[PDB]
Amino acid sequence: NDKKIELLTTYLSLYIDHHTVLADMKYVVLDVRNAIKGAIAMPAKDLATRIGELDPAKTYVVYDTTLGKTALLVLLSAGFEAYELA
Amino acid sequence: NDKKIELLTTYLSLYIDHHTVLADMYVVLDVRNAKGAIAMPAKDLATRIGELDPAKTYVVTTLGKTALLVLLSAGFEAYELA
Amino acid sequence: NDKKIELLTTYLSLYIDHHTVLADMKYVVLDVRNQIKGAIAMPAKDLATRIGELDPAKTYVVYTLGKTALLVLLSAGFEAYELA
Please name the amino acid found at residue B16: I
- Tell me the Cα Rg of chain A: 13
Task: Report residue A48: phi and psi, to 5°.
Answer: -55, -70
Which residues in chain B touch residue A70, judged by CB atoms under 8 angstroms apart? Answer: 8, 12
Surface-to-core class of residue A79, CB atoms within 10 Å of its CB (0-12 exposed, 13-18 middle, 19+ buried): exposed
Which residues in chain B touch residue A72, judged by CB atoms under 8 angstroms apart? Answer: 8
- Judged by CB atoms closer than 8 Å, whether chains meet at C5 and B73 is answered as yes
Surface-to-core class of residue B59, CB atoms within 10 Å of its CB (0-12 exposed, 13-18 middle, 19+ buried): buried
What technique determined this structure? Answer: X-ray
Surface-to-core class of residue B25, CB atoms within 10 Å of its CB (0-12 exposed, 13-18 middle, 19+ buried): exposed
CB C14 within 8 A of CB A10: no
B10 Cβ under 8 Å from any chain A Cβ:
no
d(CA C43, CA C49): 10
Work out how many CB contacts closer than 8 A connect A with B: 29
Collapsed DSSP state (helix, strand, coil) of residue C8: helix
CB B46 within 8 A of CB B57: no
Surface-to-core class of residue B35, CB atoms within 10 Å of its CB (0-12 exposed, 13-18 middle, 19+ buried): exposed
Best mutation target, B8, B14, B60, to test chain C (most C CBs within 10 A):
B14
Using CB atoms, list chains with 3+ pairs below 8 Å to chain B.
A, C
Best mutation target, C2, C4, C21, to test chain B (most B CBs within 10 A):
C4
In angstroms, the separation between the Cα of residue C10 and the nearest Cα of chain B is: 11
Which helix H or strand E contains A83, and what residues bound it?
strand A82-85
C34 Cβ under 8 Å from any chain A Cβ:
no
d(CA A44, CA A31): 9
- Judged by CB atoms closer than 8 Å, whether chains meet at A69 and B4 is answered as no
Name which of A7, A65, A73 is nearest B8 (Cβ-Cβ).
A73
In angstroms, the separation between the Cα of residue B51 and the nearest Cα of chain A is: 30
- Judged by CB atoms closer than 8 Å, whether chains meet at C4 and B72 is answered as yes
Collapsed DSSP state (helix, strand, coil) of residue C27: strand
Helix axes B2-12, A2-12, angle to 10 degrees: 90
In terms of residue numbers, what domain contains C57? 1-84
Using H for helix, E for strand and C for coil, what is the string for B8-72? HHHHHCCEECHHHHHHHCCEECECCCCCCCCECCHHHHCCCCCCCCCCCCEECCHHHHHHHHHHH
Name which of A11, A13, A69 is nearest B12 (Cβ-Cβ).
A69
Task: Report residue B29: phi and psi, to 5°.
Answer: -140, 100
The residues with which C31 forms a beta bridge, in sequence order, are: C41
The total number of structural domains in chain C stands at 1
Residue C30, domain CATH: 3.40.250.10
